[PDB]
Amino acid sequence: CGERGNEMAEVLMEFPELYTEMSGTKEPIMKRTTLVANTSNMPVAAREASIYTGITLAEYFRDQGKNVSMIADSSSRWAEALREISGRLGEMPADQGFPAYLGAKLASFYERAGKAVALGSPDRTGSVSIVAAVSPAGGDFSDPVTTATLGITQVF
Amino acid sequence: TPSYLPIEKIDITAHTAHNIGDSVWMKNGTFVVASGNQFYIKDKSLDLTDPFTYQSIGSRKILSNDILHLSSVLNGPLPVYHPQFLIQAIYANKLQLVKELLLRLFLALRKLDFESQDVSNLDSNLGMDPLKYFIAKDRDYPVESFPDPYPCFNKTVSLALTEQLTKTTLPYLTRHQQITLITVIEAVDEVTKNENIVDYNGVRFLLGVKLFLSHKNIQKSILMRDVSWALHSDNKEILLSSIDRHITSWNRAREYRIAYWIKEQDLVKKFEDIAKYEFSKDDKRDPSRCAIFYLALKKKQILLSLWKMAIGHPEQQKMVRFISNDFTVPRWRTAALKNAFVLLSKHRYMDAAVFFLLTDSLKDCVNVLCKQVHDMDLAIGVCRVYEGDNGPVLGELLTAQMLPETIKENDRWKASFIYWKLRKQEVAIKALLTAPIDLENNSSIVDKEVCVNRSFLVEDPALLYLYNHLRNRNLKYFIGSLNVEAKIECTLILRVTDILCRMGCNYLAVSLVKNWKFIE
Numbered sequence: 001c002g003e004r005g006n007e008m009a010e011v012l013m014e015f016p017e018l019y020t021e022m023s024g025t026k027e028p029i030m031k032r033t034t035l036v037a038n039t040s041n042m043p044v045a046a047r048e049a050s051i052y053t054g055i056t057l058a059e060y061f062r063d064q065g066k067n068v069s070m071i072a073d074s075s076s077r078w079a080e081a082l083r084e085i086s087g088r089l090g091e092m093p094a095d096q097g098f099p100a101y102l103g104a105k106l107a108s109f110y111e112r113a114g115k116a117v118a119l120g121s122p123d124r125t126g127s128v129s130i131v132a133a134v135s136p137a138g139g140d141f142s143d144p145v146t147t148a149t150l151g152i153t154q155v156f
Numbered sequence: 157t158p159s160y161l162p163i164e165k166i167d168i169t170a171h172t173a174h175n176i177g178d179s180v181w182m183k184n185g186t187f188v189v190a191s192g193n194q195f196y197i198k199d200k201s202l203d204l205t206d207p208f209t210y211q212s213i214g215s216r217k218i219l220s221n222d223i224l225h226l227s228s229v230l231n232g233p234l235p236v237y238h239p240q241f242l243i244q245a246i247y248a249n250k251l252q253l254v255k256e257l258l259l260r261l262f263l264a265l266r267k268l269d270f271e272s273q274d275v276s277n278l279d280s281n282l283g284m285d286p287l288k289y290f291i292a293k294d295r296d297y298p299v300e301s302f303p304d305p306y307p308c309f310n311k312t313v314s315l316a317l318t319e320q321l322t323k324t325t326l327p328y329l330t331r332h333q334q335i336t337l338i339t340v341i342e343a344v345d346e347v348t349k350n351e352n353i354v355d356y357n358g359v360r361f362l363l364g365v366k367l368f369l370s371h372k373n374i375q376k377s378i379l380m381r382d383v384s385w386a387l388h389s390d391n392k393e394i395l396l397s398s399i400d401r402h403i404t405s406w407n408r409a410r411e412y413r414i415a416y417w418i419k420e421q422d423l424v425k426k427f428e429d430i431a432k433y434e435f436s437k438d439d440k441r442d443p444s445r446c447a448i449f450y451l452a453l454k455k456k457q458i459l460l461s462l463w464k465m466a467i468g469h470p471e472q473q474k475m476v477r478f479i480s481n482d483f484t485v486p487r488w489r490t491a492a493l494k495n496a497f498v499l500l501s502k503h504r505y506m507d508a509a510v511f512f513l514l515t516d517s518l519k520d521c522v523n524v525l526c527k528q529v530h531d532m533d534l535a536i537g538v539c540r541v542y543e544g545d546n547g548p549v550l551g552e553l554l555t556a557q558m559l560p561e562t563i564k565e566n567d568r569w570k571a572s573f574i575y576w577k578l579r580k581q582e583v584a585i586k587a588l589l590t591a592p593i594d595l596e597n598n599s600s601i602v603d604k605e606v607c608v609n610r611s612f613l614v615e616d617p618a619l620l621y622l623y624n625h626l627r628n629r630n631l632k633y634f635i636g637s638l639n640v641e642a643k644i645e646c647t648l649i650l651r652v653t654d655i656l657c658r659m660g661c662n663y664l665a666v667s668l669v670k671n672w673k674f675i676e
Contacts, residue, residue: 119501 001038001050002077008037040077047081055112055128062126063118070113075106075132079145095144096137103148110152159611162208163226168196185224200224215330219276229328234660235280237261238329239336244661245289246344246363247618248668249356252297253289255309255344257282262306262313265320275324289663292671294356314345339370350394357389357625360618365399365412377411380569381618387417387573388626396422406430406534415537416573420545427453427541441466443475447510448525452538456514479514489515496520505529518542518549526557536577551578563592563601566608568619571595582633588623589648617661620652620668627675634675642674 015033019026034057038050051072058068072078079102086099094100113130117123132153136143141150150156168176168189177190185200202209202221209226218229234241236257245254260282268275291297301307306316321338329337343366347359354362364382368375386395396418403409409430418426431449435441443462450459456479463475478495481488496511505528513521518539526535535557539550554574562570571592575584580596587595593607627634634641649672656665 117503121503123503 001036001072001074002040002042002044002047002081003073005037005039005041007073008035008039011035044081044084047078048085051075051078051109055109055130058128058130059112062116062128065118065124065126067127067129069129069131072130072132074135075109075149076135076137076143076145079106098144102144103151106145106148107152110149161212161230163212163223163230164202165206165208166196166198171196185222202226215332217276217325217327217329219327232660233280233662235328236282236284236663237326237337238660239333239340240659241661241664242337242340242344243363243367244617244656244659244664246340246347247360247621248664249294249621250289250291250297250664250667251344251347251351251356251359252294252299253291255348256288256299257284258317258341258344259302259306259309259313260284262309262317262320263302265317265324269320269324276327278327280328286663290667290670309344310348311345314341317341336367336370339366342366346398350398354391354394355389357385357622358391358395361386361389361395362398368411372411378413380413380567380573381616383413383416384569384573384622385618387576388622392417392419393422396426403430404433406434410531410533413533415533415540420540423537423541424453427537435462442469444469444471444507448506448513448521448534448538451510451513452541454542483515493517493520496524500524500528513538513542519552522549522553523557526553532558546577546579554578559592559598560601563598564607566591566593566613568592568616572622581630585623585626585630585633588619588626589644615651615655617652617656617664617668620648624672628673631675638675645672645674 011033012030012035015030016028018029020029020032021027022032036050036054036057038046054070054072058070061068079098082102082105083093083096083098087093087097091099094102110130110132113128115125115127117125130153132149134143134146134149136146141147166187166189168191172191172194174191177192179190180188182188187198187200189196189198200223202213202223204210204213204221212230213226216229218225242254242257245251245257264278264282265275267273268278288297299308306313318338318341321334321341325331326334326337340363343363346366347362350362351359361382364385365378368378368382386392389395396414399412399414403412403414403426409415409426414426415423427449431446431453434449435443435446437445443459443466446462447459450456450462460476460479463469463472463479466472481491483489483492492511492515496508496515496517499505499508499511505524509521509524509529512524522535522539525538526532535553536550539553543549554577558570559574562574568588568591571587572584575581575587575595578584583596591607592598593602593604649669653665653668656662656668
């Protein structure tokens with residue numbers, strides 16, 4: 001979500017060359033790894049549709065009995081996109097220009113992760129882990145996005 | 157049990173390493189074995205230290221310790237007091253005879269005790285005249301009387317026998333067989349009380365349940381044999397009232413399979429009572445459990461009140477707000493169907509059935525009960541209480557869910573029951589004799605090679621006794637075809653004997669062949 005296009009190109013180049021014996025034989029890690037490339041030069045409003053698509057894909061694959069891992073690099077670029085939409089949208093900004101509903105949005109996103117029994121039969125159980133990289137402005141962990149995520153996430 | 161059981165391990169190797177040269181039986185079981193120029197003749201006696209002899213003899217008591225005599229105890233005609241002979245003489249219409257044999261057993265045991273003789277001297281036939289076993293009909297039996305101190309089998313003789321059978325060990329009978337003999341004494345005591353009310357398919361059912369109670373460890377519900385004995389009885393009310401004391405919970409209305417045979421007019425009352433109980437279970441009040449019984453009766457109002465008074469339950473607020481609607485409205489019908497299919501995906505099968513019954517979509521309530529909940533017993537109950545006694549949804553349910561498995565398992569009790577609930581009586585009676593795969597183009601259901609066959613197809617003598625009953629009451633369906641019916645009656649009589657003979661009840665096989673009435 002709002003990252004380099006040479007970091008999504010390296011994943012498309014190395015994951016096929018990297019293999020996993022979790023299936024019993026070396027199979028490209030790319031065979032089980034999908035991508036949601038939305039670089040920074042790409043529209044800011046699609047940094048929000050990049051995080052929804054990823055968690056929905058993980059939830060879909062958890063609904064097949066799989067233990068998926070959504071790696072969201074970065075969650076602070078989706079929050080900046082909501083800060084850029086809100087600012088152009090007129091409503092009152094919060095502490096650092098972010099909308100007052102940033103925390104609710106982050107909480108709703110992270111509440112989609114978890115271990116669950118899948119709807120329907122055969123009875124299967126899956127899980128969705130979320131690993132969200134936050135990019136605090138200047139490295140300061142007192143940022144609104146970082147504080148909200150630390151409030152929500154269980155591992156820091 | 158295995159059809160064959162080893163009784164000795166003649167271990168000649170314990171003396172020499174040379175292999176057995178030749179083996180030959182001889183007069184009286186003498187088993188001559190040769191090796192080199194050196195014989196190892198073993199007499200027909202037994203060494204009780206052998207594991208095989210010790211296991212085969214078991215707890216029995218035998219007059220002689222022989223391979224010949226042992227092979228005449230594990231096999232051959234039963235002593236007329238053996239429980240497996242008395243229950244088979246009760247299933248055959250010979251209850252009076254069983255009472256007389258029990259009386260004679262008591263008299264012989266008293267004779268032995270009075271003379272201080274050993275019980276092993278007890279006569280196997282109890283001094284019975286064999287012609288008695290051949291009497292065609294129960295009411296034609298010449299029930300003679302004995303001297304005054306114990307003239308005829310009754311409560312006093314029953315108690316005396318139950319005491320004696322604990323104070324003595326009957327010969328040839330494993331202790332478990334003696335326990336079942338005591339339960340047979342109790343069952344005959346019960347039948348004598350009810351003998352004046354229930355027809356004789358009631359007596360067979362009563363003995364079936366009394367034997368079931370003694371085998372709850374290995375038997376989880378009365379066999380379909382007993383369900384079919386009761387289903388064709390004219391006094392289902394008496395049978396139900398006799399087993400009522402045990403039907404407290406649904407799990408016990410499912411052991412006696414009451415949904416199959418009890419009259420609809422009693423099944424309604426039994427659902428009401430079972431709903432009462434299932435609600436006030438040990439744990440706490442929960443209208444979730446008793447919902448199906450109250451909807452099947454068409455008592456949604458009682459269920460609504462039950463939800464209301466269940467203030468503590470977390471689901472109470474949703475269910476009271478939902479159930480109160482009128483489900484004739486198309487919108488609410490669709491809402492209830494949607495909720496039913498959501499509960500089927502949240503793995504709440506019983507609640508899905510409940511909701512599918514709110515809207516009167518019985519065909520979907522019964523399919524969720526028999527396929528996802530695994531209660532054909534409850535599915536039949538709901539079908540019979542909701543719509544009516546026989547069909548139409550019950551017919552489709554049985555033909556779809558039970559008929560295939562019945563054909564594959566080659567079960568004729570279930571097949572007869574199914575073609576009875578489909579009110580196809582003419583072929584329901586025939587399904588007792590001919591295997592299900594050969595009925596009503598059932599070969600179209602499963603290929604004949606998928607069905608069970610080989611030694612697994614062990615006959616069931618009772619299966620014939622029921623036919624001879626139905627055949628005689630439903631003659632209207634058999635007057636039209638006699639030669640074809642005889643062609644299979646004369647096969648199943650000779651295949652029902654040859655198990656009555658292989659299970660030691662030879663005296664009953666001769667009675668079956670002697671008394672069978674061909675419908676000319």
